[PDB]
Design a protein around this ligand. Structure first.
Ligand SMILES: Cc1cc2nc3c(=O)[nH]c(=O)nc-3n(C[C@H](O)[C@H](O)[C@H](O)COP(=O)(O)O)c2cc1C
Lengths: 350, 352
């Protein structure tokens, strides 16, 4: 018994919630292509432990944009799960302290910006989108603040949505007793309005154009090819993370991996590098974490455990990686990310 | 050698600011009749001491909306006060914070809600300013999220805004460099200074008042009342706290003085919710009165700006200790040990 295997939640799930509905969380838009390698490329790349490492003091817990987090296994902009909950989403809140790190969510993530965090003194990372005008966007500046909802990040990839006809192929709408609780009281109603943001304003013309607008940081997400990404660096925001909707948006997109050093090279340091690929067993997250990482990005993973174990639920998960990967860390020795290296990780591709 | 008069400032900080600045802060609607009827108004309420009592200790200490604002005087949301010392809004939050009260800022702010809050730990409110299309509002309202602006001073008296002469002769040049970083620049999607002078909804109603509620909690106040027809109306429509006002006598003139118009506004909504009048108030002598009429706590405007503009974070920091250190004479000499023992039982007022 007990919770050991990460995808132990995967069976249970089948018989824990509605399909139509869950079809919003984990679901790969397009050809099931990118969710495969996402659980298979680091499952591909190996590591050869460094030998006889004396240990006393270890850095699992680390200084990032200030703070020394135990496990920076930060999330990623989430979405639509109140029909996957009783007492709330202050779970992933009370978690970013228990299983402390970067809490990141979305506006579809139907929680009240102030309410979820009703458990603690930490910072926060908002889900953006270049919403179909600026009465829709721009105003994100007007929310996710320093002394509050800390850092920003403009989604430099999406201006339409990945069509995975799971829920799409049936009768879905949404829980009556809900809306997009974040966007709610708007220039609405809160039925269709919010979707009408889909427009291809794919330019930096409205990116650095915004830095003179916000005082808040901007980990502009979605940067899977330094080949316009050098430009996502030549022009841009901050901590620029490669991200393919979490193994989708266009299932056939390569896993967020390959762009790892291909962008950490066409950007390096500067305004940071990251990757959004699925990393369930507390090793997988480690892989990319060496070859091109700073925190430990997620979102939906906690979505089984966000869906079936409450506040705690998600907390343990990050531990499923903080315990897990620290095992790794101290196992093959290394006690900080600087001593962490490439030729120790037995990567197939170099 | 040190000089004390809580407005001896007005005139010094008058010579410190460019015409436009002083007049932007020192105006009133057209004839400005109610400007002096904002001060010579409290003079029509005669005191009424009680004597031979224990005054070793007193008590300014409050709790407005479940908030102990250190002392009963608060700050009212003045527009760009960064023009009047490039810091303003920013150093007012820190000033009040050290002063333990509220630092209330408007949407017409120089420093944004992102920007000011870096000042750190302390109680503060933010004035809502509903606009034509409510997508930008909706997001501003939820900006002061679990950052903490506690309430929202929704300003019900500013659809078409008051005709303060001055401005439109010495045509108010919104200082090229300097910006209203609270929106700073929005647009739908196809500007600053006149974006803000490019947005608002002249049809704000108790139906919009409805909507605002499903987009938040943050105790929605009623800013801009001087009658009891919109007072009982104010409890009729779910809320707490009122911000009875004239708008620094900036929206409409010849409309009663906050103090004078007060009795009917408090007396109307009884025990439902507490009222706070932000206007006229420049001494604890006269501050006392408001609290006597039934307005549990009061905000402050102009007096707070002719201080930053005058002398930095020390400016307002006397505007508050001079103010606070003036309610400990008033409460003392009238026989009171704290707010509990005040009330208009304890006085006399001209009209009556
Ligand atoms: C420069 C200036 C701009 C103002 N703009 C606003 C505003 O944006 N909205 C609002 O409700 N109050 C505004 N106020 C008025 C106050 O919030 C407050 O009612 C007033 O200044 C208190 O009057 P007193 O100055 O005699 O204390 C303005 C006042 C001044 C001095």
């Amino acid at each position: 018994m007990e919770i050991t295997n990460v995808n132990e939640y995967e069976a249970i799930a089948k018989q824990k919630l509605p399909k139509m509905v869950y079809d919003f969380y984990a679901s790969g838009a397009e050809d099931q292509w990118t969710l495969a390698e996402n659980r298979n490329a680091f499952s591909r790349i190996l590591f050869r432990p460094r030998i006889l490492i004396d240990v006393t003091n270890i850095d699992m817990t680390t200084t990032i944009l200030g703070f020394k987090i135990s496990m920076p296994i930060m999330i990623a902009p989430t979405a639509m799960q109140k029909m996957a909950h009783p007492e709330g989403e202050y779970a992933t809140a009370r978690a970013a302290s228990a299983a402390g790190t970067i809490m990141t969510l979305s506006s579809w993530a139907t929680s009240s910006v102030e309410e979820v965090a009703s458990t603690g003194p930490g910072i926060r990372f908002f889900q953006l989108y270049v919403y179909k005008d600026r009465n829709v966007v721009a105003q994100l500046v007007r929310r996710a603040e320093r002394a509050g909802f800390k850092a920003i990040a403009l989604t430099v990839d999406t201006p339409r949505l990945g069509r995975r006809e799971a829920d799409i192929k049936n009768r879905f709408v949404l829980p009556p007793f809900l809306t997009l609780k974040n966007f709610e009281g708007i220039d609405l109603g809160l039925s269709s309005y919010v979707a009408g943001q889909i427009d291809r304003s794919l330019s930096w013309k409205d990116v650095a154009w915004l830095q003179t607008i916000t005082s808040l940081p901007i980990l502009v997400k979605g940067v899977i090819t330094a080949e316009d990404a050098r430009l996502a660096v030549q022009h841009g925001a901050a901590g620029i993370i490669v991200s393919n909707h979490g193994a989708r948006q266009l299932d056939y997109v390569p896993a967020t991996i390959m762009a790892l050093e291909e962008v950490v090279k066409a950007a390096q340091g500067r305004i940071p590098v990251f990757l959004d690929g699925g990393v369930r067993r507390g090793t997988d997250v480690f892989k990319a974490l060496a070859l091109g990482a700073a925190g430990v990005f997620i979102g939906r993973p906690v979505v089984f455990s966000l869906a079936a174990e409450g506040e705690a639920g998600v907390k343990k998960v990050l531990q499923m990686m903080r315990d897990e990967f620290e095992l790794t860390m101290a196992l093959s020795g290394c006690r900080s990310l600087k001593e962490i290296s490439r030729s120790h990780i037995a990567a197939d591709w170099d």
